[PDB]
C-alpha cells in the first residue's frame, strides 16, 4: 500500500529547475489547459524585454542604443512596465521586437549576469512573431520554458511500469525553505537541483550572494541535516547546455568566481560526451566535485550521493537520467524498509 510508492522530494535554490522536472514527468509518464498558460508566456516576454531596457542605463558603464530612433520604443516599454492588466496590443510586439533587433540592446543582454533576468528570455524574444498570433498554440518546449515562481508545496503522482511515484515540488527561495520540513518524514529520496551555469550570477534575495555558492551552502544544510541522516541525495547538476555555452563563449571565466578552479585538472573516470570540448568536461566535472567534497566529508555509509549532469528543458536527457534513477530508488526504499 504505502510502501509500494516512492515519495520524491525536489529540493534546491530558487530558479534551479525543480518545477521543470515535474513538467517533464507529465510530458513523459502522465495522461484545453495549454490555453491558460499563454497568458503567462506573454508575461515572460514582457518581463524579459523591460528588464533588459531598464538595465541599460543602470549598468556601469551604461549601454547606449545602436539606433537613437529606438529611444521612443524604450519610452514606450518603460511607460507600460508596471501596468496591472496589460492588453498586449499589436504595437507592443512591434516595439518589443524592434528593440530586440537593436544591437546595443543585445549588448546589454550579454551582460545580464549583472542583473536579474529570467532564463526564458532569448528563447521567447526570438519568437515574438509566433507568440503574438491570436490563434497561437504553445509548443511543449514553450511550456518547459515558461517561468512561474513556486510558492507552497505541490504533489504530483505518476506511474512507471506500474511503479508508483509521489513527487513534491517546493519553493527554493529563502522565504520558502521553511515549508520543506513538512516532507522530510516519509521521504524516499532527495532530488537536489542545481543551476550549473549560474557561477557568474548572484541570487535575487540580496543581489550579492553568488548563486553557485548559495547552492553549495544549501546542499551542505540538507546533507548534514539532522532529520536527513538516512536519506540519499540524487544530485541533478542542471542547465548543462547554458554552462557549455558560457564556457565556449569564454567571456566570463570560472576561475574568477571560484579561484580553486585554477588548481583543477580533469578526473580519470571522466566520461565525456561524444564531441564534447575538454574544457566543457573540465568545467562540469569541477562543479560536480565541489558538491562531492561536501558529501564525502560526512555521512558514514548511512546515506549516499548520486550525481547526474542534466538539462531539464531537454525531454530526452531527462527520460534517460530519470531511468538511471528508477534503478537506485528501488534499492533505497529497500534500505530504509529493513533498518
Amino acid at each position: 500500500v504505502y510502501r509500494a510508492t516512492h515519495r520524491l522530494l525536489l529540493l534546491g535554490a530558487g530558479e534551479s529547475g525543480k518545477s521543470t522536472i515535474v513538467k517533464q514527468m507529465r510530458i513523459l509518464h502522465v495522461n484545453g489547459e495549454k490555453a491558460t498558460k499563454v497568458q503567462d508566456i506573454k508575461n515572460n516576454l514582457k518581463e524579459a524585454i523591460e528588464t533588459i531596457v531598464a538595465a541599460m542605463s543602470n549598468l556601469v558603464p551604461p549601454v547606449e542604443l545602436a539606433n537613437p530612433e529606438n529611444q521612443f520604443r524604450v519610452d514606450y516599454i518603460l511607460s507600460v512596465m508596471n501596468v496591472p492588466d496589460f492588453d498586449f496590443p499589436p504595437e507592443f510586439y512591434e516595439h518589443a521586437k524592434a528593440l530586440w533587433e537593436d544591437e546595443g540592446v543585445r549588448a546589454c543582454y550579454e551582460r545580464s549576469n549583472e542583473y536579474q533576468l529570467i532564463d526564458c528570455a532569448q528563447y521567447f524574444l526570438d519568437k515574438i512573431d509566433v507568440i503574438k498570433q491570436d490563434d497561437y498554440v504553445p509548443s511543449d518546449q514553450d511550456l518547459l520554458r515558461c517561468r512561474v515562481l513556486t510558492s507552497g508545496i505541490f504533489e504530483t503522482k505518476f506511474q512507471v511500469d506500474k511503479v508508483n511515484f509521489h513527487m513534491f515540488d517546493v519553493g527554493g527561495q529563502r522565504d520558502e525553505r521553511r515549508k520543506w520540513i513538512q516532507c522530510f518524514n516519509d521521504v524516499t529520496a532527495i532530488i537536489f537541483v542545481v543551476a550549473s551555469s549560474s557561477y557568474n550570477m548572484v541570487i535575487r534575495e540580496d543581489n550579492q550572494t553568488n548563486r553557485l555558492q548559495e547552492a553549495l551552502n544549501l546542499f551542505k544544510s540538507i546533507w548534514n541535516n539532522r532529520w536527513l541522516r538516512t536519506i540519499s541525495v540524487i544530485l541533478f547538476l542542471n542547465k548543462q547546455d547554458l554552462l557549455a555555452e558560457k564556457v565556449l563563449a569564454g567571456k566570463s571565466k570560472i576561475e574568477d568566481y571560484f579561484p580553486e578552479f585554477a588548481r583543477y585538472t580533469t578526473p580519470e573516470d571522466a566520461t565525456p560526451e561524444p564531441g564534447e570540448d575538454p574544457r566543457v568536461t573540465r568545467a562540469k566535472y569541477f562543479i560536480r566535485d565541489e558538491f562531492l567534497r561536501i558529501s564525502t566529508a560526512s555521512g558514514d555509509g548511512r546515506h549516499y550521493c548520486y550525481p547526474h549532469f542534466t538539462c531539464a528543458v531537454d525531454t530526452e536527457n531527462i527520460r534517460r537520467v530519470f531511468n538511471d534513477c528508477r534503478d537506485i530508488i528501488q534499492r533505497m526504499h529497500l534500505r530504509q524498509y529493513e533498518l
Binding site: 508545496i153 504533489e155 520540513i181 513538512q182 516532507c183 544544510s221 541535516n225 539532522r226 532529520w227
Partner: protein, 189 residues
C-alpha cells in the same frame, strides 16, 4: 498540597509558531507541523537532564508555551532565580539549533517572576500537578507582554538578578488585570 515562599516561575513561548501552523493535504492536515513542535518541546526536555538544571521542574506546555519553575525541591539563597534565567538562555540556544535545520526563524519570548505559590494536584480524574498564585499570573503576563528574544522580569526579580551580576533595563510600565500598573525590566546579554 502545600505552599512555598520563593519559587521562580518561567513562561517561554514561541509567538511565530501559530503562523507556521497550517492544515492541508500535503502536511497531513497540520500533523507535520505538530511533528516539528514535538521535536522542539522534546529538545527542551533534554535540558532537564543537565546537572546544572536539576533544580528545574517542568510544569507543563500550553499550546507552544513552555512552563517551568525553580525552588520546588526546596523547603546562596536566590541562586535558583539565576538558574531559571540560565535555563531561558538554554532554550534560546536549542531553538536556534532547530532553526538551522528547519530553515525557519522562531524567536523565544520569555517572562520570569519569583514569589509565593501553592503547589499541588487538581482534578478528580487524572490528578495532575499544577502551581497557583499571583506570582504565576504575573510571570504569564511578563511573557504575553514581552518582546521577542527578550527576558522580561518584574522589579523585585530585577533587583535580585543584579545582586547576582546581571544588568536590566526598564521596559516601562504594564497594566496587570487585578494588580494595576507595574514597572518591568529586560535582562541584558
Amino acid at each position: 498540597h502545600q505552599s512555598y515562599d520563593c519559587v521562580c516561575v518561567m513562561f517561554a513561548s514561541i509567538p511565530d509558531f501559530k503562523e507556521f501552523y497550517t492544515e492541508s493535504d500535503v502536511n497531513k492536515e497540520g500533523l507535520e507541523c505538530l511533528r516539528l513542535l514535538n521535536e522542539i518541546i522534546a529538545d527542551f526536555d533534554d535540558l532537564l537532564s543537565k546537572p546544572k538544571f536539576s533544580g528545574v521542574e517542568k510544569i507543563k506546555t500550553i499550546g507552544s508555551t513552555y512552563m517551568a519553575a525553580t525552588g520546588l525541591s526546596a523547603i546562596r539563597q536566590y541562586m535558583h532565580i539565576g538558574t531559571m534565567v540560565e535555563f531561558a538562555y538554554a532554550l534560546v540556544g536549542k531553538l536556534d539549533a532547530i532553526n538551522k535545520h528547519s530553515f525557519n526563524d522562531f524567536k523565544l519570548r520569555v517572562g520570569i517572576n519569583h514569589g509565593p505559590v501553592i503547589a499541588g494536584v487538581i482534578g478528580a480524574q487524572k490528578p495532575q500537578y499544577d502551581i497557583w498564585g499571583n506570582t504565576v499570573n504575573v510571570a504569564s503576563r511578563m511573557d504575553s507582554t514581552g518582546v521577542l528574544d527578550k527576558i522580561q522580569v518584574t522589579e523585585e526579580t530585577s533587583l535580585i538578578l543584579q545582586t547576582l551580576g546581571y544588568t536590566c533595563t526598564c521596559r516601562g510600565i504594564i497594566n496587570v488585570k487585578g494588580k494595576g500598573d507595574l514597572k518591568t525590566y529586560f535582562v541584558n546579554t
